[PDB]
Design a protein around this nucleic acid. Structure first.
Length: 50
DNA sequence: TTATGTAATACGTCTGTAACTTGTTCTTATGTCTGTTATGTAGTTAATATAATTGAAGGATTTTAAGA
């Protein structure tokens, strides 16, 4: 499985019309809720909870 | 020649078998009534107590309605 902790990933420029590689961070515990922090194509940082 | 008397032979026939049928008589299987016990239903309890719940997770593409 995936080790608990924080993983920093990117979409490799395959989502938006332009390249615009978008970066996100995901924290996963052994037990509990997930947290996500993404970048949008407008260069603003957003949060997702579960 | 012809009466006579035996003998073959064909037909009734008296009786022994068997089929058709009923009486009735006894036995048994079944349907029903009744009494008793277990099952199924229902109502009530009065320190006080006053916004769940449990997960779940590397998807990748299309098409089509709402929002602006």
């Amino acid at each position: 499985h995936r080790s608990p902790g924080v993983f920093f990933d990117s979409d490799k420029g395959k989502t938006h019309s332009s390249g615009k590689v978008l970066y996100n961070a995901r924290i996963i515990p052994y037990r509990g809720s997930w947290l996500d922090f993404e970048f949008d194509p407008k260069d603003n940082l957003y949060v997702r909870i579960d």
